[PDB]
């Protein structure tokens, strides 16, 4: 009815897809084999799955995801794991050679071959729909197929599909944590080429998730599984109003026009609360005021950027659970009393609210615990300028004497595209400063 | 506790509507009539003449059997009526003897 | 007096009737055709998916 | 005591006529075997219009089934209410000639037309005063649109006095389903003009629109469409079969509805066609029946009545009602929607009420509109035909079976002549 | 009332045939699920409730577009529980806002 | 037999319509199936005002439900009293306006307006009086505002002499709950000003304050607020359905409120609103009933009438109740403080008295105050609009579908003209 195709690309895409589709299946009650036990003699008419799962006429809920990657390892791990018969094996596209963390290799040489295959797959999953709300691409700015193949995917999808909203979850490089070294080159290039093709671009920093998991979830040694549990809860709280009955239900296109002031600035921050574990959530009530203050707490954001060094241009809060609207407005007004939350000069109506009824779903083995109410807050701030300057300094400091450039030249991209991307992000920095002052 | 309009258009009146249909005609119907004309057919509906001009009008009529302002016959009625036949005959005889002559 | 006329609010008004017309619909946006994608070659030399 | 025969031609016409006999057989209370088992005596009061007595208390339809392919015909025989026709009116063909007006009128069908005329003559002088014929066909094939129109011409030169009905399914831009439909339709309209007294142009596109957006059917198939067409046929020729407050004979409608001798292409309609869910939410009255009659959604052709002028309009009501309110509602539609009516014909609606309702709902009313918006269907068929004709596509079959471009272009000329006649009486200056 | 009873007879006559075929297929060890999905109580194509008051019909709510597309169903049990956890059987709004008499 | 066609626009519109139809079904004694189970004949004597007639003892609402998101129509259908609504009056789309007045007015939404006007025509000429139409919309949403304004424009173009009241959930002063709500509110008021006949501006924060301070209730949800708004609707259109000692209909209320055409934004208000525990501490008579209705806490809008001047005040009292006391208190508030009252209208109170109290009360009252203190809400909306518009914030969304900044400048010109008009008629002296 209101469908959303998930476009998991890269190793980050595959892992986030695993830890997000397990949450989706257990939230809708769908077993790993595909069937729903779900006491079908009683009721069973709920079409709440018809955003992510497609029928077969037999009770098989085939999902709406295209797991695309260049190395076969993670996709074959999916095809071997417990969610093996759940996914259509023509939906899990894989290549042979990795992009080797090259935007040029993933966009010009290797990505040019299987993009047609995955786009035909998108065509089949798109005309197996009754009206498409928007694609959701879970990619990484780290480098490779998560930056170049996602580039080619969006550059083809913008031409092919109308307006057709193109939500982004991005693994932004952390300020100091990095598993790679061509991360600034790849991030500059993919930001420049997806600037005019993206509609919202939620970045998340792995360092910030590490801090959140070590502080709030009480995990001494977190990992990518827990990180993707947090990402899964974020995306579930975002597109829960498309699926479940709510009071002030807020679907996929509402929080685009209520959050994006200008088409170039489409880079919000996603904050989830409460991220408290079981042994400490034993100890206090997680009321609406407490979780709203937790979202506006600056050491709970998932990109390592200080929001106090910035102006909140827009804020869209999605409450989920046992939530009452006078408490919503009381918490928002108590937030607006504080002067250390500085909304931007030209937007006094800085809040867009949504309320969904069903409490968020817990997973049996994850460290996030079962709460009866939660908040997902998506905010455009001017505080991403410090992160963009942090990565700009690294790009200029590596491109001053031409490190790791002959590889991009050899697998295809010319010398000048680095300068075009450089001036594009300089223009974006000036745009952030101008809309901030 | 009833009411005028409430009783007027929720009548507690149990009429005798026939619907004496064979349970084979009633099964050949309502299978064509599964989506179009999905309703109990109106076999009780008669024609306008058949339902308006009934014998019950004559049964419930309380008209006096002699209408008290009607003219009678009399002792010279039949002779006066057949006198018109005389007029026809004994003028036609003269006319047709004139036709012959 | 002629009360045979002037009867819009006098007696019970039978409903003046309009005409109906069909509806077109939302006219959904374009989906990018089945011909538009040329699938990569499988039979021959080096392939990319097989 | 006036009777009309039925002649089914082609696969479409045979299925539609089979459903027509199958829905009027239980309207008159008839067994699948043929014996009477209905409720009222008024079902058998007028039975000679469609039926004949047999030995015992059973009835045989006065119908001739004509098609060149035995599969459709024996499917009709093996279907429900199939064991009621006389097995001597079934005239099969030899080949499967099909979608070919030459392989209809000129070849194959000319070898069968003698036997069909013989069996029609046998069914025709088997009655005391024949009123007319109704034939069911589609202008897309080569059997319904070909030798069926040959039968129409032969009947016209045989009995040039009787009322003629052709319930023709005519092609549509959508739901086209055939590639030689403009050729067949343009070749068939030429014979349909000067050889019939009244035609009923029915669109599969409008039938699907009614069956999907008004009846809300999950599986619409063709039995439901034939049910709609058959209900329209019964609503048309109900005044011959049942007494009414005033009645509408077929010749009465022919006199009242075609003003000039070549404008007898009527689009039909029916009310109330309502969904099972929404049937309990509307009551059944003459005012809303007028809406569901005059609505363009419930018109059985894809014409837009706002794109033209109503020349004449029917309202053949069927049920228990007051026709003070029927007549003033037929007045009120003309009083409001005065733009879409010809101003040189005052009160251009012929109404009738035929007392005994159709089986089911309490009321109904069928519609016959001689709008000038049927020229959309004719103009579109003509432009598709002349698009396919200049490049001479799919013409070698017709030239091999025997035609020429002379006959093709004279059919084109007469076809645009009919379009011009309707455009002449469309919106212009009356005085 | 006879039309409503005819709809009830239609449902109780379809469901015995549906149960016979479902039981035969269950004895034959088939999937059964498409048959059980098709044999749902109601008289329309909608995915909504049975609407037992109006003769048991799940009406067909359709979108005005090129291809119809029925209105879905989203009302779960937990959503209704947290919806009525504070308000408590929605006719209680009147009693909550005073309005006692 | 005067009557209103009701219209629900947007998510807020469908919820408000659901609660309104619930409360007046309870008022007229109608179960969710649609059958009369009440006892008094006065509950049924005037039921054609809001209910049509169906097959049986059914009573369908005369409402049209419009939305561009399927979830709200799903909620209204599958909740309580969803059985009573017609499936064809559920007219809706799938894409969604998405909080955009442009995407609810110019693009898709103008694609539904033909179907919605078809249904409005349907139940509008299925009438005999048609006192008017009603739109229970919200200002701050896409299909709540843009679709609603388009529908008001088309309906006022077709039927220009009929009552066209709207109930206009206006944006809150504090806590926005929507970002582009100043754009939507300004660009929607710009249409309401020269389109509608009367408007009851209702504010969610004011309703929260009522449901929290006065009725206690701690958690006020949305059912309570919606039942207040629906009770205000009943208190408005109660003297048209029920007999009264001195009754006032919608036309009478409009005439006695608006002195000039562009002054039709009023103050809702209801009395008595007391808690469960405070219901046995206060006597319920005319003095308490009028002072709790004139209390500025009780003001259902979001602007204090203490700083401002009343143009006119409507008091719709309800119950078997003496009215010397009513007239004396309407006199006495003016004589106590005429400073918050225009001196160029001598007795600026319209008063109606209805006999039958609302279901669940002995005696009640309803406030409709045309005041010059509503100008600060409009000034607030104007200043938020120009604050968000001088930097061209959130403007590409509206300009992408076919408008420009010229329309926004015209909307602000009209908005500031009405603000200056309210200031002029506030500060104008008698002589
Ligand atoms: N949060 C999170 N980040 C991930 C995950 N997997 C990979 N990443 C990030 O992705 C960055 C590199 O991109 P990868 O996804 O590992 O590789 P790729 O996108 O498939 O492209 P290739 O390197 O050519 O294989 C690393 O710096 C990681 O921080 C994950 O599961 N969760
Ligand atoms: N309404 C209706 N139309 C039909 C049916 N069967 C076929 N048609 C139409 O008839 C056309 C084909 O014509 P055909 O039956 O082959 O003509 P024939 O050569 O005389 O048999 C198709 O375009 C269909 O739309 C039916 O059962 N009902
Ligand atoms: N009174 C009332 N207000 C509502 C309701 N739903 C939403 N609102 C208010 O209306 C605004 C959103 O309007 P919305 O319903 O999204 O408009 P739409 O998108 O056009 O349907 C929010 O600021 C809410 O405060 C409701 O059911 N009742
Ligand atoms: Mg990889």
Q: Which of A109, A102, A87 is nearest to A8 (CA)?
A: A87
H or E element that contains B2: none
Cβ(F144) – ligand 3 distance below 6 Å? yes
CB-based neighbours (< 5 A) of ligand 4, an ion: A 11, 71
Query: Cβ distance D398 to D183 under 8 Å?
Result: yes
Closest residue, chain B, to E5 (C-alpha): B40
Dist. CA A424 → ligand 4 center (Å): 27
Strands (DSSP E) found in D241-362: 265-271, 310-319, 349-353
d(CA A204, CA F66) in angstroms, rounded, equals: 39
Task: Please tell me which chains touch D, using 3 or more CB pairs under 8 Å as the contact test.
Answer: B, C, E, F
Ligand 3 atom 18 nearest Cα: F141
How would you classify the pairing of strands A373-381 and A269-273?
Answer: antiparallel
Residue F403, number of CB atoms within 10 A of its CB:
17
Method: cryo-EM
Strand partners, D64: D7
Name the residue with tokens 């009056």.
F89
H or E element that contains D369: strand D363-371
Residues 6+ positions from B8 with CB-CB distance below 8 Å: none
Strand partners, F353: F246, F317
Rg (CA), chain E: 19
Instruction: Give the up-direction half-sphere exposure of residue D420: CA atoms within 13 A in the CB hemisphere.
Output: 6
Query: Cβ distance F135 to F149 under 8 Å?
Result: no
Q: Which of F254, F298, F299 is nearest to F274 (CA)?
A: F298
Secondary structure of chain D: what % helix, strand, coil (to 5)?
A: 45, 20, 40
A397: left (phi over 0), alpha (psi -120 to 50) or beta: alpha
Query: What residues of C are in contact with residue E62 (Cβ under 8 Å)?
Result: none
3-state secondary structure of D86: coil
d(CA D335, CA E86) in angstroms, rounded, equals: 56
Dist. CA A140 → ligand 1 center (Å): 6
Instruction: Answer whether C19 sits within 8 Å of D335, measured CB to CB.
Output: no
Q: Which tokens in the block code for residue F197?
A: 């006949």
d(CA A291, CA A269) in angstroms, rounded, equals: 17
Residue D36, number of CB atoms within 10 A of its CB:
15
Instruction: Give the up-direction half-sphere exposure of residue F428: CA atoms within 13 A in the CB hemisphere.
Output: 14
d(CA A340, CA F425) in angstroms, rounded, equals: 42
Substitution target from F29, F77, F94, F272 for chain E, most E beta carbons within 10 A: F77
H or E element that contains F156: helix F142-158
d(CA D325, CA A151) in angstroms, rounded, equals: 69
Instruction: Answer whether B30 sits within 8 Å of E10, measured CB to CB.
Output: yes
d(CA D63, CA D22) in angstroms, rounded, equals: 12
| Cα diameter, chain D | 63
Query: What residues of C are in contact with residue F107 (Cβ under 8 Å)?
Result: none
3-state secondary structure of F304: coil
- Whether chain F has a CB inside 8 Å of the CB on C44: the answer is no
Strands (DSSP E) found in F109-261: 132-136, 163-166, 169-170, 199-200, 202-203
Helices (H) and strands (E) counted in chain C, each on its own, are 0, 0
d(CA A274, CA A295) in angstroms, rounded, equals: 8
Measured at the CA of A71, the angle between CA A68 and CA A73, to 5 degrees, comes to 100
Strand partners, F200: F266
- Whether chain B has a CB inside 8 Å of the CB on F409: the answer is no
DSSP 8-state class, residue F183:
H
- Displacement of CA D298 from its chain's centroid (Å): 16
Residues 6+ positions from A276 with CB-CB distance below 8 Å: A216, A217, A286, A369
Residues 6+ positions from A251 with CB-CB distance below 8 Å: A2, A133, A241, A242, F69, F71, F96, F98
d(CA A199, CA A195) in angstroms, rounded, equals: 9
d(CA D23, CA D232) in angstroms, rounded, equals: 11
3-state secondary structure of D262: coil
- Whether chain D has a CB inside 8 Å of the CB on F56: the answer is yes
d(CA D225, CA D231) in angstroms, rounded, equals: 10
Residues 6+ positions from A9 with CB-CB distance below 8 Å: A68, A69, A137, A138, A139, A145, A146, A149, A150, A153
Dist. CA A101 → ligand 4 center (Å): 8
For residue F284, which phi and psi values (nearest 5 degrees)?
Answer: -110, 90
Residues 6+ positions from F40 with CB-CB distance below 8 Å: B3, F29, F356
Query: Cβ distance A24 to A31 under 8 Å?
Result: no
d(CA F382, CA F392) in angstroms, rounded, equals: 15
- Whether chain F has a CB inside 8 Å of the CB on B40: the answer is no
Q: Which of F211, F213, F239 is nearest to F227 (CA)?
A: F211
Q: Which of D193, D178, D237, D10 is nearest to D103 (CA)?
A: D10
Whether the bond into F272 is cis, omega within 30 of 0: yes
Secondary structure of chain F: what % helix, strand, coil (to 5)?
A: 40, 15, 40
On the 0-12 / 13-18 / 19+ scale of CB atoms within 10 A, A135 is buried
Closest residue, chain E, to A358 (C-alpha): E79
Whether the bond into F75 is cis, omega within 30 of 0: no
H or E element that contains D4: strand D3-9
Instruction: Answer whether B5 sits within 8 Å of F45, measured CB to CB.
Output: yes
d(CA A296, CA A281) in angstroms, rounded, equals: 19
Q: Which of F294, F383, F277, F362 is nearest to F331 (CA)?
A: F294
Residue F383, number of CB atoms within 10 A of its CB:
12
Q: Which of A182, A238, C19, A214 is nearest to D341 (CA)?
A: C19
DSSP 8-state class, residue F175:
S
Measured in angstroms, the resolution is 3.3
Q: Which of F50, F43, F49 is nearest to F21 (CA)?
A: F50
d(CA A98, CA A147) in angstroms, rounded, equals: 13
Name the residue with tokens 């026809």.
B88
d(CA D291, CA F122) in angstroms, rounded, equals: 8
- Whether chain A has a CB inside 8 Å of the CB on F69: the answer is yes
Which of A155, A254, A386, A420 is labelled catalytic?
A254
Whether the bond into D272 is cis, omega within 30 of 0: yes
d(CA E43, CA B35) in angstroms, rounded, equals: 10
Residue F172, number of CB atoms within 10 A of its CB:
22
On the 0-12 / 13-18 / 19+ scale of CB atoms within 10 A, E17 is exposed
Q: Helices A183-193 and A150-160: crossing angle, nearest 10°?
A: 0
Query: What residues of D are in contact with residue C14 (Cβ under 8 Å)?
Result: 287, 325, 328-329, 332
CA distances from residue F270 to A326, D408, F138, F256, F363 in whole angstroms, order as listed: 20, 79, 20, 19, 11
DSSP 8-state class, residue F357:
P
Tell which F residues from 52 to 81 touch B, by Cβ distance under 8 Å: 57
Residues 6+ positions from F414 with CB-CB distance below 8 Å: F190, F193
Our answer to whether residue A254 is catalytic in this structure is yes
Name the residue with tokens 């990518």.
A224
Query: Cβ distance D233 to D167 under 8 Å?
Result: yes
- Displacement of CA F201 from its chain's centroid (Å): 6
d(CA F170, CA F185) in angstroms, rounded, equals: 7
Residue D404, number of CB atoms within 10 A of its CB:
11
DSSP 8-state class, residue D313:
E
Strands (DSSP E) found in chain C: none
Instruction: Answer whether B4 sits within 8 Å of F41, measured CB to CB.
Output: yes
3-state secondary structure of D189: helix
Q: Which of D305, D302, D303, D307 is nearest to D206 (CA)?
A: D302
Query: Cβ distance D258 to D25 under 8 Å?
Result: no
Measured at the CA of F380, the angle between CA F378 and CA F381, to 5 degrees, comes to 65
Q: Helices A416-436 and A183-193: crossing angle, nearest 10°?
A: 70
Q: Which of F61, F87, F71, F84 is nearest to F14 (CA)?
A: F71
Q: Give the nearest partner residue to D38 out of B25, B33, B35, using CB atoms.
A: B25
Q: Give the nearest partner residue to D281 out of F86, F122, F126, using CB atoms.
A: F86
Instruction: Answer whether F121 sits within 8 Å of C18, measured CB to CB.
Output: yes
Instruction: Answer whether B39 sits within 8 Å of E10, measured CB to CB.
Output: no
In SS3 terms, chain A reads as CCECCECCEHHHHHHHHHHHHHHHHHHHCCCCCCCCCCCCCCCCCCCCCCCCEECCCCCCCEECECEEECCHHHHHHHHHCCCCCCCCCCCEEECCCCCCCCHHHHHHHCHHHHHHHHHHHHHHHHHCCCCECCEEEEEECCCCHHHHHHHHHHHHHHHHCCCCCEEEEEEECCCCCCCCCCHHHHHHHHHHHCCCCCCCEEEEEHHHHHHHHHHCCCCCCCCHHHHHHHHHHHHHHHCCCCCCCEEECCCCCHHHHCCCCECCECCCEEEEECCCCHHHHCCCCCCHHHHHHHHHCHHHCCCCCCHHHCCEEEEEEEEEECCCHHHHHHHHHHHHHCCCCCECCCCCCCEEEEEECCCCCCCECECCCCCCEEEEEEEEECCCHHHHHHHHHHHHHHHCCCCCCHHHHHCCCCCHHHHHHHHHHHHHHHHHHHHHC
Q: Which tokens in the block code for residue A269?
A: 């921050």
Q: Which tokens in the block code for residue A124?
A: 């089949």
Instruction: Answer whether F273 sits within 8 Å of E98, measured CB to CB.
Output: yes
Residue C35, number of CB atoms within 10 A of its CB:
6
Cβ(A223) – ligand 1 distance below 6 Å? no
E67: left (phi over 0), alpha (psi -120 to 50) or beta: beta
Cβ(A17) – ligand 1 distance below 6 Å? no
For residue F131, which phi and psi values (nearest 5 degrees)?
Answer: -50, -45
d(CA F12, CA D263) in angstroms, rounded, equals: 54
d(CA F40, CA B6) in angstroms, rounded, equals: 9
3-state secondary structure of F90: strand
């Amino acid at each position: 009815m209101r469908e959303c195709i998930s476009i998991h690309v890269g190793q980050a895409g595959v892992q986030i897809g695993n830890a997000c589709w397990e949450l989706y299946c257990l939230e809708h009650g769908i077993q790993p084999d595909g069937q729903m036990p779900s006491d079908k003699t009683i009721g069973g008419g709920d079409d709440s799955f018809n955003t992510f799962f497609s029928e077969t006429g037999a009770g098989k809920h085939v999902p709406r995801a295209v797991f695309v990657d260049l190395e076969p390892t993670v996709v074959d791990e999916v095809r071997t794991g417990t969610y093996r018969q759940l996914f259509h094996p023509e939906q899990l596209i894989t290549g042979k050679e990795d992009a080797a963390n090259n935007y040029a290799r993933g966009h010009y040489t290797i990505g040019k071959e299987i993009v047609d295959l995955v786009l035909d797959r998108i065509r089949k999953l798109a005309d197996q729909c009754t009206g498409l709300q928007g694609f959701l691409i879970f990619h990484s700015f780290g480098g490779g197929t998560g930056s170049g193949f996602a580039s080619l995917l969006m550059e083809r999808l913008s031409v092919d599909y109308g307006k057709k909203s193109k939500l982004e979850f991005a693994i932004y490089p952390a300020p100091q944590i990095s598993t790679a070294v061509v991360e600034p080159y790849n991030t500059i290039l993919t930001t420049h080429t997806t600037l005019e093709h993206s509609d919202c671009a939620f970045m998340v920093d792995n360092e910030a998730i590490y801090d959140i998991c070590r502080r709030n979830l009480d995990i001494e040694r977190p990992t990518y599984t827990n990180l993707n549990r947090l990402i899964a809860q974020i995306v579930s709280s975002i597109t829960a109003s498309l699926r479940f009955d709510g009071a002030l239900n807020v679907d996929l296109t509402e929080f685009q026009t209520n959050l994006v002031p200008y088409p170039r600035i489409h880079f919000p921050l996603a904050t989830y609360a409460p991220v408290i574990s079981a042994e400490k959530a034993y100890h206090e009530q997680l009321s609406v005021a407490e979780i709203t203050n937790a979202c506006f707490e600056p050491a709970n954001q998932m990109v390592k950027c200080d929001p106090r060094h910035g102006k909140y241009m827009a804020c869209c809060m999605l409450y989920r659970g046992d939530v009452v609207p006078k408490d919503v407005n009381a918490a928002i007004a108590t937030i607006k009393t504080k002067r250390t939350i500085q909304f931007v000069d030209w937007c006094p109506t800085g809040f867009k609210v949504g309320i969904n009824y069903q409490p968020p779903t817990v997973v049996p083995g994850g460290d996030l615990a079962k709460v009866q109410r939660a908040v997902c807050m998506l905010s455009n701030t001017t505080a991403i300028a410090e992160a963009w300057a942090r990565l700009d300094h690294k790009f200029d400091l590596m491109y001053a004497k031409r490190a790791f450039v002959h590889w991009y030249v050899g697998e295809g991209m010319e010398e000048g595209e680095f300068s075009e991307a450089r001036e594009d992000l300089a223009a974006l920095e000036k745009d952030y400063e101008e809309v901030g002052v | 506790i009833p009411g005028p309009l409430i009783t007027a258009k929720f009548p507690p009146v149990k009429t005798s509507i026939s619907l004496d249909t064979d349970p084979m005609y009633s099964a050949l119907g309502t299978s064509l009539k599964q989506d179009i004309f999905n309703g109990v057919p109106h076999s009780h509906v008669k024609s306008l003449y058949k339902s308006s001009f009934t014998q019950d009008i004559h049964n419930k009529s309380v008209e006096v059997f002699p209408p008290k302002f009607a003219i009678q016959r009399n002792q010279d009625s039949k002779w006066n009526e057949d006198g018109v036949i005389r007029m026809k005959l004994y003028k036609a005889w003269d006319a047709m003897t004139l036709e012959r002559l | 007096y002629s009360p045979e006329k002037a009867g819009r609010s006098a007696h019970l008004h039978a409903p003046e009737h309009t005409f109906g017309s069909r509806t077109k619909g939302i006219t959904f946006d374009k989906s990018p055709a089945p011909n538009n994608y040329s699938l990569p070659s499988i039979l021959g030399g080096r392939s990319c998916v097989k | 005591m006036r009777e009309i025969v039925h002649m089914q031609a082609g696969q479409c016409g045979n299925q539609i006529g089979a459903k027509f006999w199958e829905v009027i057989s239980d309207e008159h209370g008839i067994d699948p075997t043929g014996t009477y088992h209905g409720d009222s005596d008024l079902q058998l009061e007028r039975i000679n219009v469609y039926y004949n007595e047999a030995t015992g208390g059973k009835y045989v339809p006065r119908a001739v089934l004509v098609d060149l392919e035995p599969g459709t015909m024996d499917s009709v025989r093996s279907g429900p209410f199939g064991q009621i026709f006389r097995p001597d009116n079934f005239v099969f063909g030899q080949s499967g000639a099909g979608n070919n007006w030459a392989k209809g009128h000129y070849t194959e069908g000319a070898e069968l037309v003698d036997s069909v005329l013989d069996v029609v003559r046998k069914e025709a002088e088997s009655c005391d005063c024949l009123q007319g014929f109704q034939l069911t066909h589609s202008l897309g094939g080569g059997t319904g649109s070909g030798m069926g129109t040959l039968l129409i011409s032969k009947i016209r030169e045989e009995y040039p006095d009787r009322i003629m009905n052709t319930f023709s399914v005519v092609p549509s831009p959508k739901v086209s389903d055939t590639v030689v439909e403009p050729y067949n339709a343009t070749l068939s309209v030429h014979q349909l003009v000067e050889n019939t007294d009244e035609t009923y142009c029915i669109d599969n596109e409008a039938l699907y629109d009614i069956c999907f957006r008004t009846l809300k059917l999950t599986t619409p198939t063709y039995g439901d469409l034939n049910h709609l067409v058959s209900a329209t046929m019964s609503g048309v020729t109900t005044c011959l079969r049942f007494p009414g407050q005033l009645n509408a004979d077929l010749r009465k409608l022919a006199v009242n509805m075609v003003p000039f001798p070549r404008l007898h292409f009527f689009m039909p309609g029916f009310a109330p066609l309502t969904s099972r869910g929404s049937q309990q939410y509307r009551a059944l009255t003459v005012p809303e029946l007028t809406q569901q009659m005059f609505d363009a959604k419930n018109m059985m052709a894809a014409c837009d009545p706002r794109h033209g002028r109503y020349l004449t309009v029917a309202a053949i009501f069927r049920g228990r009602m007051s026709m003070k309110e029927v007549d003033e509602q037929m007045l009120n539609v003309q009083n409001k929607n005065s733009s879409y009516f010809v101003e040189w014909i005052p009160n251009n609606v012929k109404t009738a009420v035929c007392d005994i309702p159709p089986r089911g709902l309490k009321m109904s009313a069928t519609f016959i509109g001689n709008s000038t918006a049927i020229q959309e269907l004719f103009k579109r068929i003509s432009e598709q035909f002349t698009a396919m004709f200049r490049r001479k596509a799919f013409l070698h079959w017709y030239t091999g079976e025997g035609m020429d471009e002379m006959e093709f272009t004279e059919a084109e000329s007469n076809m645009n002549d009919l379009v011009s006649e309707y455009q002449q009486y469309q919106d212009a200056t009356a005085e | 009332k006879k039309n409503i009873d005819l709809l009830a007879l239609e449902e109780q006559q379809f469901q015995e045939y549906a149960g016979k075929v479902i039981k035969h297929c269950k004895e034959g060890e088939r999937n059964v699920y498409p048959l059980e999905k098709a044999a749902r109580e109601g008289h329309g194509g909608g995915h909504g409730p049975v609407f037992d008051g109006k003769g048991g019909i799940r009406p067909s709510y359709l979108t005005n577009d090129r291809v119809g597309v029925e209105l879905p169903y989203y009302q779960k049990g937990s959503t209704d529980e947290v919806k009525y956890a504070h308000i408590g059987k929605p006719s209680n709004t009147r009693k909550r806002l005073g309005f006692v008499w």
